[PDB]
Amino acid sequence: MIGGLFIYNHKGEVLISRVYRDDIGRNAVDAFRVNVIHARQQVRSPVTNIARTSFFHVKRSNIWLAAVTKQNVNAAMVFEFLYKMCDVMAAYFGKISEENIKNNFVLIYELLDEILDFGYPQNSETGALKTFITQQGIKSQGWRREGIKYRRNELFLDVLESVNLLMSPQGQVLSAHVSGRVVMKSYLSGMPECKFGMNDKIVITFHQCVRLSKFDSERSISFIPPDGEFELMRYRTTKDIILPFRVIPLVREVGRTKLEVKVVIKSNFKPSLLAQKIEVRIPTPLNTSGVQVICMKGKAKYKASENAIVWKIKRMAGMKESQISAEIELLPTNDKKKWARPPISMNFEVPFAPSGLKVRYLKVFEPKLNYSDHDVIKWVRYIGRSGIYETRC
Amino acid sequence: KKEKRKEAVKKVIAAMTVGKDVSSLFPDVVNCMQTDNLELKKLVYLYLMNYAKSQPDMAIMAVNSFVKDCEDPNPLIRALAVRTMGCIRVDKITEYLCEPLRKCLKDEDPYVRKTAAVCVAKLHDINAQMVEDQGFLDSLRDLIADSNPMVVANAVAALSEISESHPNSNLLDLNPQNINKLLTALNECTEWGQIFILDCLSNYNPKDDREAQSICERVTPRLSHANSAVVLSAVKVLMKFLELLPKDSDYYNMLLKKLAPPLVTLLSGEPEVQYVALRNINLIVQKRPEILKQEIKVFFVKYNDPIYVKLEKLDIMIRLASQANIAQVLAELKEYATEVDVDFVRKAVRAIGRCAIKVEQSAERCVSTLLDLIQTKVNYVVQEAIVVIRDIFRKYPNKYESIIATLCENLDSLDEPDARAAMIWIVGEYAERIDNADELLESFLEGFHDESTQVQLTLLTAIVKLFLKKPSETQELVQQVLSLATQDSDNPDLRDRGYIYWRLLSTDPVTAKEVVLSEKPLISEETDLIEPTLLDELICHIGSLASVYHKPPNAFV
Amino acid sequence: DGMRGLAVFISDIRNCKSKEAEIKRINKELANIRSKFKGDKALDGYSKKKYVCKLLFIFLLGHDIDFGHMEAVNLLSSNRYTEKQIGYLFISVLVNSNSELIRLINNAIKNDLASRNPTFMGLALHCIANVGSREMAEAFAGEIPKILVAGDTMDSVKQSAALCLLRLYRTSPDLVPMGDWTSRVVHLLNDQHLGVVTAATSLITTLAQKNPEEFKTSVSLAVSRLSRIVTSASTDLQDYTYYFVPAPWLSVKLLRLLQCYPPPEDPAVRGRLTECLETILNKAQEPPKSKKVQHSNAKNAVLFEAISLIIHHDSEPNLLVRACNQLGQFLQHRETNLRYLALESMCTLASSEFSHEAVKTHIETVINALKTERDVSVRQRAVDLLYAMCDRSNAQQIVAEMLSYLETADYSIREEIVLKVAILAEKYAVDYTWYVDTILNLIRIAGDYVSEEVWYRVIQIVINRDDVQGYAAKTVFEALQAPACHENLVKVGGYILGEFGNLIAGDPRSSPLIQFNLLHSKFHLCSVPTRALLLSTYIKFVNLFPEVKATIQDVLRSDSQLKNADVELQQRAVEYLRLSTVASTDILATVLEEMPPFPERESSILAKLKKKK
Amino acid sequence: MIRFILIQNRAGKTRLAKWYMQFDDDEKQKLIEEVHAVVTVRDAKHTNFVEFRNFKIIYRRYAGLYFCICVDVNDNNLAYLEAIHNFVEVLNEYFHNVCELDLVFNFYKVYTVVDEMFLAGEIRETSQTKVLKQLLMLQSLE
């Protein structure tokens, strides 16, 4: 009896659609979008007769529900069914929002199929329909020795992360992976429960005392830190990665007498903190005999043993610029050299997490001594190392 | 590998729902349908739905898979396969669907039977011309008598959808003692099943008074909480069964007294249900006035109702206002007068005039409150007020004529075409007293074009009236609208009426005076009624959209 | 280093918390810059530049700024180029109304223009032309032309001055005279460089569009420049060959300039222009030199400008035929931009009488593109082009295809289509029975979106023609008794049946009783204007069909119409009742019989189509 | 003539607003909002010459930015699209890589590039090599 169903956002984009009658098509979609989303001076009314096709609509937050019909439908039955559907969605995946609908397409489709078929709004009881739906929606809102005592509160929190990348010479990134390990030292007394606040933003061997049962809610982690240095776990985040440096090498084979190479490093992190020990290795064809290098920043030298040009920067701030231009003397050779197309390799270290991982909170509660968590004075230093960071050229 | 396959299928379904075409991966999903997990098969069938409902053509090749799946023992997958096979609107769908459906109708599961009934209704929509459709229709009637309520509800819905074709068939349902079965279904069905079966039962007819009384007594207690769907269908079937004589047993009076309270309570739900219930009670009040006789207090619109609910509450309040409720209605309208909303305030100030025409006892009070409301000096308020006073003059003649002066004191702007028509008509009709009528109607004849057709027509009639009342002075102005609206205007209605007047004035002026300037009858308390036969046939369609649109179902399908 | 603090400020204001924290930070920085400007020894150039740039970013971020603007003009009176650039950018982005402020800005710019560095003059000219003002035009009307003269000025300042003069002429047309520099600009046209040629071409194009009499010489020079540019060498002017296409922008500007002039007077110039256009078409027909899409876009831009130039001249028949062939070839191009431009250009081309048959050849391709464009703008351009090529031997197919498109088109633009169908049917109908059928098809199909004045036109045609009256009446009679008919059909039916009811009364199957009964059945549920129209139709039936007079009286004597709450219906009912009651038979026959044909008016449909679009 | 130049992004923030005629304070915001709404809906299989109101814009996606030039109805379509591509190429070869961060941190240099290749609503300069040379000659000077 219900000829269709559509869900609209504030801009009128059709998030979901389910057409049951043959008569209703994209013309009805455009009709509703134009006639309610782009209304100019017409008086508001839930049911509108346009093109001999009815259009029921119920507004919920920033979501427009439209139950398009093309018959003598029981007029208030559609409204009752829409309210029941909203209640069912509230029971399943809570409040209606853009993210919820965008992430629960399968749940929405299954729910519409179960509650509605050919236009007759069948039973919508939550308990009855619970057993009839197999999909579930996604909602987005160490032993120690006895008597361990430390007179001085010394705690280590090192975020060691390895960044790897290989971009196209034109500037397009192809593949990147990260292997991160966390090492901490806990010079603490008693048996306290320590809370570690962090923004996961990713789903992931963990320690014996580490339990990840409730890791879904932010962090919600509780663990007993053993004494000494140890590895927490291995993880890899790719969705949210902040590349510390970018290299755009502009090489040019101007004949065989000489070769022109131009590499630019463009820091793109926060300028408040300074990267240290910036090393860039520019490979050189084996036909070289003597080369001259000019660098706007730092100093560079030629390493004939490694058959490459070494470039070192003492320290630079964020969002700076540096120019290295080298005139490469090229031997005449015979043929088929092509310089083998070697990538541009760089190594460095930065005082921040390459993945953007920032500690949220660190609460320490000791049942025995009962000292405040704010009484623990500790400053956190980060050592963000670099792995095989090579850019193709 | 099953979990990886399920994850891949879910990712493919999400990508298809995103908008990108994934028709290249169709064979993988088709092959993946041969699994054992119910969730995997269901998720495949949703993927197939994504293509089938919108544009079916690429999923036709899965007919063999559908036939193979239809024999599965779990009722969920069996019903899913039946629905999926029926969902594709193709010519060959009938051939592959008829054989499984006959065995499906006798499936040992209520859910399978309900899905089969919906599938029968789906198959009757496309390519239902052979005797197989008639056989399925005959089998459905036998299927109506069943233990499960879901199956009887869905079968009744299928029969209602099928009965669109009327080849001299009595809706392909109903029989002796079958109404008892339908009421027994009402006893144990769900809310939506109750709606379906009651909408179908409203298409029956009563043979004797005893049967009608029994049916009415059985239906009334089913005032559920499905908003105004089950209750509206209940009142529709009750009023359609109002075959009881007024001079009969004390049930009709009991029926009205038991029907008024539940119908009052409809105005307590969500605003859309408010709107539908308001239009429907509007129709019911217009048909039967002795239901909401002493329940006006519920229709007073508060600040929590939207614009359409406000307007319809005012409409029904005007419908219910009588001499005994003038004080409250006018006080509440004076309160409404300062509600900022332009459409609502126009309706509220026009209510003061429609009530004045409706109730002749309090015309003086209505005029007093109209004057006090005009003193507000608001442009749209004053324009709707001049329209209202134009309406009042046609009802009470030569009694309130002085009011147009104290309203013209505040006519700084005239922009509403209805207000312009009202002022022009008022000047034209009383042209033997307004000395400046000639000057006014000459002033109006500057932008004659680019005006609404009603304004043009009323101005033309007013000018001809002014000519017929003062022929000597103004026989140089009537020929300035009879050669400016009959020659220079492209409006066959307007142009032909202009020739009608032109020929009356030039053939026999005595008949012209006896025709145009005739003593018109009064409005006679016309409260915007509906034609009796249209109301009679809309009472048969209370629940449907015919009531909300106030049009018969033949005018739109 | 110029300034590093701006970077840390931007990083602080970017990766901040919710907008409350950002507002707090921006207000703190605003207070800080308030304190810095107020007093103290803030004469350091770097400090001033930092604060001005910070404040400018504060404005561009979306926050209101109304102070710290005197420092902007303080920066200008300086020798450092970067400080002057920041000051001029601040003046351009933020403008204030203070007579002394504008006076000092004008003094600074006047001191700027009397320099010997192209950078300073370029900055001053950019500042003048990037804002535009009556005060600036009045204070610099006679300075920029004094720079466009062939003095010891660089090319960059020449381009800047030419575009500044264009801007001033665009904003203050009465403030630019035509003294002894018009010939200087014309001679600047054939100068060295290529950018100065571009700026001079823009200025000359605008001025010629304004005052064609001054630059009658420029056409020959533009033709010579275009002929030289189009085919000079494979790899000449290596800095301007935009992907193996020599200067597409200069060629486009020159073709537009030639378009803004009638055909050249000199036959030699006409021949040179014709051969240049022919070689442009030939080069466009050649296979592309590069597989990239940018070479294709450059070649096609120059080619489409050439096609538009040819259309504007409308003088060469062979060139017009070649242009139509090229556009027809582009109608099937793989890209969508080329298809859309081809449809637009052919829509322009179809008006010319020298290639109407050539346009009509591609009707099948245009119809297929209309059906399967898969876009929303390409289909509209296809509709426009189809409306362009319609003729007396082509109306039936095009109108039928437009109706098929209308049946399944989006309802946003479902009105331009019905207007176009109605005007095509009215204009290009051989037998008006087809026009009546097409208008009734529009009424049935669209109905809600038809017009205010299409059914006026159909009633006008039916009344005036007197040869389609019988078929119009019959079609309306068998079109009203359909179940679902739009009220527009009810109005047209009322009028047509009232005026020509006797042309069907010969058939016993359509006696006046059945016509009146169906009209009354439609009478109950309609708006007030429709009821007025039907009441006029009833009073026409009173004398046209005396057999149904009693029934008509019984209709318009009841309490439903004589007591109607609307003035129009009540007046019509009472007049018609009196007219039927007097029954003089000598006045009722006279009043309701003539309906003389409509005089030929300006075809309001075309006027409303032009006004709406 | 060129009506205005906009460098937007997928989110909707404006990284470069350059208007060549005087608009009202709210008119600019309304224009930016409706331009973003129009541009975001379309995709690769669509014309770049989308028109609205009495104007038409020439939108062309690049990385994560939506370069948009609005031109008069009579002005050419492909020439301004290629002017946009030329402007993008000059940005790419000047910054050595174009990205939203560089535009945000170098708004004044983007403004001077736009005023270098788009002056008074027309196309001031065409070639990239000459613009780059003159700009480098205007960057080492202080």
Side-chain angles (χ1 to χ4, degrees), chain B residues 14-15 19 26-27:
Chain B
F26 186 106

Side-chain angles (χ1 to χ4, degrees), chain A residues 10-12 14-17 19-21 24-25 27-29 31-39 45-51 53-58 60-61 63-69 71-79 81-83 85-86 88-94 96-98 100-101 105-109 111-112 115-123 127-128 131-133 137 142-144 147-148 155-169 171 173-180 182-184 186-190 192:
Chain A
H10 62 87
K11 275 157 27 167
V14 193
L15 280 81
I16 74 152
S17 70
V19 178
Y20 305 136
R21 284 321 185 200
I24 294 90
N27 305 324
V29 191
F32 186 75
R33 204 211 290 101
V34 165
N35 287 180
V36 298
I37 301 299
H38 312 331
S45 54
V47 56
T48 67
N49 184 14
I50 62 170
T53 296
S54 312
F55 280 87
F56 308 106
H57 86 89
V58 176
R60 291 268 162 159
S61 175
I63 301 299
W64 287 71
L65 318 182
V68 186
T69 57
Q71 203 201 339
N72 202 20
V73 179
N74 203 290
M77 191 206 68
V78 166
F79 289 132
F81 156 71
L82 282 153
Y83 297 151
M85 191 216 298
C86 279
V88 166
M89 292 180 183
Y92 263 50
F93 66 104
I96 299 95
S97 70
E98 281 296 71
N100 295 115
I101 295 175
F105 276 103
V106 175
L107 182 63
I108 289 163
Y109 272 31
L111 179 57
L112 266 69
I115 196 182
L116 192 42
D117 46 347
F118 198 61
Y120 311 108
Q122 319 285 354
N123 304 65
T131 180
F132 264 50
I133 295 311
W143 293 97
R144 294 83 70 81
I148 290 300
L155 174 83
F156 282 142
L157 193 83
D158 271 351
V159 186
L160 315 184
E161 171 156 50
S162 180
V163 61
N164 264 327
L165 188 153
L166 193 46
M167 65 183 73
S168 179
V173 60
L174 301 162
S175 85
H177 63 267
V178 163
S179 160
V182 174
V183 183
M184 56 199 164
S186 85
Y187 303 170
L188 61 83
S189 65

Side-chain angles (χ1 to χ4, degrees), chain D residues 1-9 11-12 14-21 23 28-29 31-32 34-44 46-50 52 55-60 62-71 76-99 101-136 138-139:
Chain D
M1 88 179 286
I2 282 178
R3 195 90 60 211
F4 58 87
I5 314 180
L6 289 184
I7 302 196
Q8 301 201 92
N9 49 15
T14 290
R15 308 298 211 209
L16 165 68
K18 191 79 184 308
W19 310 88
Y20 288 113
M21 46 186 45
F23 283 102
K28 293 186 183 190
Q29 197 272 331
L31 274 174
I32 277 163
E34 75 176 357
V35 161
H36 183 27
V38 170
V39 168
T40 317
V41 171
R42 327 170 57 82
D43 55 347
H46 266 80
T47 47
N48 302 324
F49 316 105
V50 54
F52 54 71
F55 292 165
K56 69 166 173 281
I57 57 171
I58 305 300
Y59 86 102
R60 174 76 159 156
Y62 271 109
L65 302 173
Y66 291 164
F67 296 78
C68 305
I69 289 180
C70 176
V71 300
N76 206 321
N77 282 256
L78 283 164
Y80 283 120
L81 180 54
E82 276 184 343
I84 288 162
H85 180 91
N86 212 37
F87 171 72
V88 164
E89 268 205 5
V90 161
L91 266 293
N92 203 359
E93 291 196 350
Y94 177 30
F95 294 174
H96 316 96
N97 196 359
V98 63
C99 56
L101 300 167
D102 287 330
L103 308 187
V104 166
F105 280 82
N106 277 255
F107 50 88
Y108 42 101
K109 286 181 184 78
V110 179
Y111 266 89
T112 198
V113 159
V114 172
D115 277 338
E116 186 66 82
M117 294 183 286
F118 291 112
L119 185 58
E122 296 269 359
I123 298 179
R124 200 191 95 92
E125 192 67 27
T126 300
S127 66
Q128 314 159 0
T129 293
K130 188 181 289 183
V131 162
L132 281 178
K133 186 258 280 182
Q134 197 269 358
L135 194 150
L136 292 193
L138 260 65
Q139 188 274 331

Side-chain angles (χ1 to χ4, degrees), chain A residues 48-49 73 75-76 83 121-122, chain B residues 154 192 272 308 543 545 549:
Chain A
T48 67
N49 184 14
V73 179
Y83 297 151
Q122 319 285 354
Chain B
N154 264 331
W192 282 278
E272 283 83 13
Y308 36 85
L545 266 175
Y549 281 166

Side-chain angles (χ1 to χ4, degrees), chain B residues 122 306 326 406 530:
Chain B
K122 192 181 291 182
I326 301 299
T406 182
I530 297 169

